Amino acid sequence: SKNVVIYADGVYDMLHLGHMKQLEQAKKLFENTTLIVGVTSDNETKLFKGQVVQTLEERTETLKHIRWVDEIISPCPWVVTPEFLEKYKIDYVAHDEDIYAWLKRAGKFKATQRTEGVSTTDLIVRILKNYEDY
Amino acid sequence: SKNVVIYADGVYDMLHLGHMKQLEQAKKLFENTTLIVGVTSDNETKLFKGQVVQTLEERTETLKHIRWVDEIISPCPWVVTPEFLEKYKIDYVAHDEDIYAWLKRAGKFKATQRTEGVSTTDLIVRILKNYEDY
Numbered sequence A, B: 001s002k003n004v005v006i007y008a009d010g011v012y013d014m015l016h017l018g019h020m021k022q023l024e025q026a027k028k029l030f031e032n033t034t035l036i037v038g039v040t041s042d043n044e045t046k047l048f049k050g051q052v053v054q055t056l057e058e059r060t061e062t063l064k065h066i067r068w069v070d071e072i073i074s075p076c077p078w079v080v081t082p083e084f085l086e087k088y089k090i091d092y093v094a095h096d097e098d099i100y101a102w103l104k105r106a107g108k109f110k111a112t113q114r115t116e117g118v119s120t121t122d123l124i125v126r127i128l129k130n131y132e133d134y
Ligand SMILES: NCc1ccc(N)nc1
Pocket: A009, A010, A011, A040, A049, A077, A078, A079, A080
């Protein structure tokens, strides 16, 4: 019943049930937690991963309404470092290695799952069904 | 500092920042509240209002992750009645009259605002900008 600090980062563009379940899972890794959520910057996301619909301000403002989210770092650093974990006193990083090998060697890696098919892009397809024909 | 029970209902299809701000506003109408959120059924919504993308189960499961939501009635009745307020001991109904005249006569109506332009349908337009040309 000591409080465990969990860090989860991501883009969190067009937040959907998949993101929410993953956040829920991080929050509940232990009985008593503080879930810190990192939100990646627009430039770094675009340069290193892919396009983003929503600004950093929009993606962060949305996460503020999520029950599981206790603290937000926005923008977060694109790569997690041992110094960053010390600075914010982070006990574990939650993510669904090569990059993460050092986190697992330190015992600070907690896996979470993805929920496929519940995404924002998947919803528009359902709207189209009422039409897609000849 | 006595606890005030607030009821807000709606479709909550493809939940977005607009819905979240409105829920936040209901939750914070008084210092100490229980926010009950009613989620309208698929059939009644379709018959009386318009199309819906997500099932009742999907719309309800999403609201479960929202910080401001304390209790959910799913499905909720399509029309609020004085008997329903008694049954769930509801002090105020929060909504953004003809229909609601009786609620205001009873002192049980609290207005909230809408946030236009932050909707799910408005996000797809931004994606299209990268293309819309000749
Ligand atoms: N969603 C991918 C990703 C990339 C970098 C980072 N720091 N976090 C997440």
